Amino acid sequence: GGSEFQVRSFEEIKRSGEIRIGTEGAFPPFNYFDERNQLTGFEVDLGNAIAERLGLKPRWIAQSFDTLLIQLNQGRFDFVIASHGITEERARAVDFTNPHYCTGGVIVSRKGGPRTAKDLQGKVVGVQVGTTYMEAAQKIPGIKEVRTYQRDPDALQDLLAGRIDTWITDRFVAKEAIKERKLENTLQVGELVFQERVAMAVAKGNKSLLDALNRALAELMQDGTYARISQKWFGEDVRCK
């Protein structure tokens, strides 16, 4: 159906009564399509609670991860919530909110497989395109091959099939995939390779919206809504401490 692309200030958004939110929809349990083919996840619930707290009806747009930041700047959405770690490189093209969770990238291998960055010597490592996982894998020398996937669950599929030695991904995504697929006796979570603060993104220079999102997030963290949503998803509070 197409849409009107525009980078919108907070007051322009407020006038419309609607906030357009970009996400990926292939990164469970943060944002994904469930068994009845509807968009959900910790970040969807969070996104909706943000929209609500601002007096705005959310309109969700799922699309491939590698495209999200560039379509944000082109004006397809007002903000993106799609598990983006804050990086200096990314902050050149977008403005990040205060982080809505903290986490890290972790080595995942089959039983008896690589557990440390050092173990990745002559190994084949699977990572999703445009991610901090791919970025870190590119900097670990002596990996035989960094294999890059458009979608992160595809890397998991290749780890299981034995086409790669190691998948590097988010620690919560790794834990949940193992629980979901009952892979406790088949997969092995190794070392935390790096830690990261994960945040919403706004088009570069969209300071009015940036500030409103920060305020709404602060409010959710104070009024118990964040705690409730984190509990539902993780049985614990995942905010940066």
Ligand X SMILES: NCCC[C@H](N)C(=O)O
Q: Does 132 bind ligand X (CB under 6 A)?
A: yes
Residues 59-78 that bind ligand X (CB under 6 A): 65
- 165 with 125: CB under 8 angstroms? yes
Name which position in 24, 43, 78, 95 contacts ligand X (CB under 6 A).
24
The Cα 226–Cα 223 span in angstroms is 8
For strands 79-80 and 18-23, give the pairing: parallel
The Cα 10–Cα 88 span in angstroms is 25
Q: Which stretch binds ligand X (CB under 6 A): 80-88, 114-122, 218-226, 227-235?
A: 80-88
In whole angstroms, how large is the CA radius of gyration of the chain? Answer: 18
The CB density around residue 3, as the number of other CB atoms within 10 Å, is 11
Q: How many residues bind ligand X (CB under 6 A)?
A: 13
Q: Does 170 bind ligand X (CB under 6 A)?
A: yes
Q: Does 23 bind ligand X (CB under 6 A)?
A: no
Measured from the CB of residue 1, what is the shortest distance to ligand X in angstroms? 25
The Cα 195–Cα 102 span in angstroms is 8
Q: Does 28 bind ligand X (CB under 6 A)?
A: no
Q: Which stretch binds ligand X (CB under 6 A): 70-78, 124-132, 177-185, 229-237?
A: 124-132
The Cα 98–Cα 70 span in angstroms is 20
Name which position in 131, 206, 225, 230 contacts ligand X (CB under 6 A).
131
Q: 128 vs 206, which CB is nearer to ligand X?
A: 128
Q: Which two tokens stand for residue 204?
A: 């570069």
Q: Does 83 bind ligand X (CB under 6 A)?
A: yes
SS3 call for 187: strand
Tokens 């979570």 locate to 189
Q: Write the binding mask 200 to 239 for ligand X: x where contact by CB under 6 A, - elsewhere.
A: ----------------------------------------
Measured from the CB of residue 176, what is the shortest distance to ligand X in angstroms? 14
The CB density around residue 43, as the number of other CB atoms within 10 Å, is 28
Q: 9 vs 39, which CB is nearer to ligand X?
A: 39
Length of the chain: 241
Please name the helix (run of DSSP H) or strand (run of DSSP E) that holds residue 208, with its range, or none.
Answer: helix 207-222
Name which position in 27, 42, 79, 149 contacts ligand X (CB under 6 A).
27
Q: 193 vs 212, which CB is nearer to ligand X?
A: 193
Q: Outline where 141-190 has alpha helix (H).
A: 152-161, 171-180
Name which position in 23, 97, 128, 166 contacts ligand X (CB under 6 A).
128
Residues that bind ligand X (CB under 6 A): 24, 27, 65, 82-85, 128, 131-132, 152, 170, 198
